């Protein structure tokens, strides 16, 4: 192949151009997103039961659906919660690699068959089934700065005018509205109802009868009478359209002929479908949209389309309506793109600099400048063929591959310059000889590096999905790199390089360059001198090698591991939790203080606070809230003190003084769809019908035990909500029957008045919406109000609720949890400083084994992955080692010589560990993939040293010591030029701060340290490895030359 | 004030002792009028009951619906706590806002022993709730022949 | 595929303007287009024009005074004039539907409306003419 | 059966349409509701969409809106069909 | 049409470029391809 293209340099150019063309097109067309799919696919079933308590939801809805969730493929686990807002969410999580469409369809199909068993009130709200593990693309807020709209007015505008044009926008797929379209609200007055001997039953009946859409056939309808001349639709009752029409619904015609209208017993207004959530944006009423990215969609295209679409809409907004963008991952992603292209461009420049420093002509510096972009561009085409996207992980995979690509270019060019100088051959013929020295090794290296990077791709779960992104990117670029080194760079060497006179080493040059050549020629002789003396006493250095191997192991077990570094994503979260029974108004004052703090004490860093009153991360309820804080751009937040991590620690400190609530600020994880990373995720499970109270007791037992091991477990806490007072009202059946009051009228009166009831639909400005009845607030606040509601007996008398009921306080749950269909309580926690999450987990299981009989447990989330993915790391690296050995055995035609390459592995690893340890970083995924690429480069350096030495003995008959020294003499320069370019090119990543610097620092630091010790140590140790391995495994005259 | 209530709800002894030792109102009532004694009787923390009574906790505190710690303890079968409360002056015939007495509640659950203790302490066996029902009526309606006898 | 030739345009009510105002806008566009026969040819709506329909209003007060339930009224009107699927029967071994409807000659003309009677709570039969009124208006036979 | 265009549109068509989201590769949706008491809602997908997956996603969203339709409509059957396929033949049956 | 008009020029631009490149490789020459590529109008005028 190299000879073919040396003779056809235009054909070689055409192949490189077509590669670049394919990659450039792939770049224009591939999906771009912050991360690919990493979280295991999850499907969430959501239902609502207006007015229902947690237990009612759980026992009429949640259990019913759960009992039908079987016969579903690739299911890992199922979890659910049922809460006091009358909401249930059941989440089914599937194995990594499950096709999410098939999982959603199988869940829906099983749900579908259970729908006739759910209360009609739940069926009528809609039971949704959504892919819930997809990432948030943006959060749009909508406010009215004229101050003329409630959150209900704004939510209606968004629902009716905005939300569907967004769903139709290019690449969107899934949209959550903050609030609801309008409902017609009928706010009943029990005093006026009783005055006319009416109940909510009568109100509901009248609405269903007088807000109705009737099918009435046709005049002249078919089959018609002969001779019919007229055909017309008959139009009878049609849905009502306004508060005025609902107000004139006729409830009753009195004895004296007078009329009771709906507006005589109720206030009537357009309002929300429910009022459990107050949403504010910088203290103003707000609605909005949570917008998810569809699987495998382009995020930069979708975001820019959404924003132009909303601009298509702005002219038609009512006065004051304003669109805000508190969350959009687009800026952070573009930062990431820009930083990686920057790193790539400056790597190219530094390779030019090192090429000209050592080879001193601009002609040679052009070839790596051509080859590396060709390979980079082309890697995109390979990614496209395999269906990957451009994302944080694939992009850092490319920057981690720069060392390997730069090396293929340097190795080809430098070896031709060496052959010309040492033999006076002309470029064309020097390139043919040089490719003959190295191309077999290049092909072996490709197979070896495959063996290093491919096994990664077969890790399971989420972390398997992350590694696979690096594994396919790096292997693809490396494979393309070797192709380019056999096709294009030889052709370019032959045609572009200028001859060098035999023996000319530039020492007769003037100025800096002549000084440098004499300096470097002298340095090489000192190097070979030093190696030659090392080879006189190899046993001593073997001992030094063991020392290094031991220290590496020591550093390895002391380095804490982690997942992905936290980033400053320009947003963070603050949670708000008030005591049991606390009301919405009280939560609102706390949220108003949180908002005020950020917009005054952090006026310089904070752009907005999006405050939600009524849901939190522990659950929902009037005593829960969230404040989503969006910061000013990173550029206007200079300094460590103005980054998310510092802002959030101040806020939490500042909010320690607030005594009427628990308020905590925290950063997002790097991959928000995953949450977590840190700690463990434990499920305590009632496996014997013990009931909720006995479960809580067991939980409290476990929690106290854990607190007695702060040496190992830290912050073991329940994830959800504590029991709270609830008002238990008992209907006396005997008294109801004695009075002639039907239980149906009682329960409907109580539920419709206090819980509210969806009656039927109406048409609001051409759009179908819901009608709700409920008591006006002031007649449904306190237990005293219960007795103001009257029910009509069979004999016509009105009977107050107090005549047939009684009440008392008790405790119950506002949020019931279940795990794999059994009652459960989720417990969060983590390992104490300097402990393994694996051993913390072991302690949890031991504590848990002491709990009462019938209480079991399981691991979920981050911990389920670990508990099913720990045996992988040793056996996959065992596979890698074996295949590397085998590739080397084939390359060298030898079962023993492979060892002299394979021993290089610790040399780079010790430097990586030192740089991470010195810098206080962790063993995380960027560190791990850096390790493999450092190890890859060091092994490649060793393969070529050993290849040159073996070929000197085989094809030129030189003795062991002479071949070894000549080999390392020839390799010193290309080894040093790659290492210098690569160490310099990673330097900006080591020192980077700001947007994305968590990842940059993690890829740069272990690579820089490991490149240093791999370079410095390998150039002395692999001559030793080769000499000692050849001496230990041989037979006849290898120390002496021969013919 | 509030630390006592949740301490007594949680069942955390030395805390409670430290809080009267630091001056916490034993008669502090949450939003539904439950006192630490209500909470301790409810959940069944016998030793806590003794410590608050030892510290002057109103043995006949009532919540916003008229119910007393003895009601809670009788209802849920905490026999020893019923005895303790009764030895410390618990009104054996206290009525909540529904007319319901500890005897009614204990009868409704079938706690024969509590019923006998309450009777021994002078529970009015003929006390009627707002619907005219006595503990005997409850036992008949429940079918509990053992209880129906004692009454 | 149909089509090939020409263009296919959708006019859209994006502000709750309602069907009548939409038709007006449409007619405006259609007349403008007709004033450029140099460029546009045969610009026409794809669907149907509004037609007379018979609007019948039930008087709730009179129905309640007579003791006639609205359910009986709307079922009588719909079942007789529109027809109603009741339940299934078996025809030569095969399940099929049962429908009730008025015989054609009692559901042709507005005069026929008053021949239908509804039974009040007190047992008297009340003709539709006692509690309803009617007028002509325009509406759409095909809403897009 | 028996319904006018507006009645069809406001008790059936709008209800179903409000639940047609969360559907992949959708280019546009159009509907008509007429005086014969009939509605047809047509969802058109990008060239290259797998038609089985599109039909299943539409059906699934329809399924969840079925309890909100009048019982008279549910009882007629609400069908979901691939409508862009070509006609193979038209057979007539007469009695001479 | 409203979403498929930018395609025709850029896809034929791609065709032209790849044809040139294949010819350059066939002939080992950046210029000789032009002497084939100029034939394109000759057949097109007769079709038109
Ligand atoms: C948990 N989730 C998707 C959020 C997040 C932020 C929010 O600000 C909100 C929700 C739920 C949504 C659902 C909507 C719902 N719908 C689209 C009309 C709905 O009626 C409910 C419900 N879950 O019953 C709401 O609470 C709701 O009105 C609401 O206020 C929400 C809301 O404000």
Residue numbers in the entry:
A (entry chain A): 1 to 1043
B (entry chain D): 15 to 165
C (entry chain A): 674 to 817
D (entry chain A): 50 to 145
E (entry chain A): 866 to 913
What did the publication describing this PDB structure actually write?
To assess this, we solved the co-structures of V612F and V612W in complex with minocycline via X-ray crystallography. The introduced F or W side chain is sandwiched between the reoriented F615 and F610, forming a stack of aromatic rings, and closes off the groove of the DBP, thus reducing its size. Minocycline is shifted in the binding pocket to avoid steric overlap with the introduced F or W at position 612. Compared to the wildtype co-structure, the contact between R620 and minocycline is lost, but appears to be compensated by additional H-bonding interactions via carbonyl oxygen acceptors of Q125 and G179. Further, the flipped F615 is in interaction distance of the aromatic ring of minocycline. The V612 variant co-structures demonstrate the plasticity of the DBP that is able to accommodate the ligand and allows the formation of alternative interactions despite the alterations in the binding network. Corresponding to these results, the resistance against minocycline is only marginally affected by the V612 substitutions. In contrast to wildtype AcrB, that crystallises in the LLL and LTO states, the V612F/W crystal structures were exclusively obtained in the TTT state.
Resistance nodulation and cell division (RND) efflux pumps are secondary active antiporters that are ubiquitous across all domains of life. As part of tripartite multidrug efflux systems in Gram-negative bacteria, they span the entire cell envelope and export a broad variety of structurally and chemically unrelated toxic substrates. During drug efflux, AcrB undergoes a functional rotation where each of the three protomers sequentially cycles through the conformational states loose (L), tight (T) and open (O). Substrates can enter the PD through several channels and bind to the access pocket (AP) in the L state and the deep binding pocket (DBP) in the T state.
